[PDB]
Amino acid sequence: MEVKEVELELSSEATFLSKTSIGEITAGEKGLNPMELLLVSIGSCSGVDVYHILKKKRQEVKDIKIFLKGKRREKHPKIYEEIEIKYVAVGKVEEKALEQAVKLSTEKYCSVLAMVKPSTNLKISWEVKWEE
Amino acid sequence: MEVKEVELELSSEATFLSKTSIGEITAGEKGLNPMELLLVSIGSCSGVDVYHILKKKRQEVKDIKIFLKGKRREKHPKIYEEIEIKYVAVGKVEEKALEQAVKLSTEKYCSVLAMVKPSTNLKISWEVKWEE
Predict the structure, then answer these.
(1) Distance (Å, whole) CA A31 – CA B118
(2) Phi-psi region for residue B14, left (φ > 0), alpha (ψ -120 to 50) or beta?
(3) Strand partners, B15
(4) Residue numbers in B near A98 (CB within 8 A)
(5) Which residues have a C–N gap over 2.5 Å right after them in chain A?
(6) Which of A64, A91, A100, A101 is in Cβ range 3.0-4.6 Å of A53 for a Cys bridge?
(7) Least CA distance to B55: which residue of chain A?
(8) How far is the alpha carbon of A58 from chain B, nearest alpha carbon, in Å?
């Protein structure tokens, strides 16, 4: 069982300097918004999967853009009732390759997404911009 | 329904520059680790709750340290089978005040934590270091 550890310490009002393996970032009221960070966590996790999968399937990736939008419940806790994720692959990428990468990631490989899926409505979409 | 939005773009191999409301951070294989970021997201979210609650209940906070440890499943998706969160309040803080803040946060206010709770075993603990 791989162990992941982070440590937070108050830096400013309701804000925390957060120590991770690569460095420290400020998260909180006056720093990176916590719920936006959750989306970044989801996007990067899945993004890592899509990148490796597209590469394994011989696609030529010039760039990968991932857009995430979350709609929060109005009452506490204000979790995301819905999360929209749109994947845009740029380069010589076949739509079928991107679809496989997205589905394997969202349904099997991305750990962050697997942890929140049961608590929200996930809407996934994707598109390719063929470029040389 | 408040809407939160972030946008990611490939920056280096399997890494993404992630645009949020305060700025951009690198998340991925060569940047902030995605699963460590989830822990930072959880810690800061809850941390924001604890800070405000302790303040409302007239406690004199000199500092707040939050330690999070996650134990991941060995098979995909490698979600956290367990997440340990330890809250340390420093200053003129009564243990009862910290307990109330932690429980209200973990059971009602923190949105990030509410989204992953159903998928893992959460172990919460706390302590105060009385300081003047």
Answers:
(1) 27
(2) left
(3) B12, B28
(4) none
(5) none
(6) A101
(7) A14
(8) 15
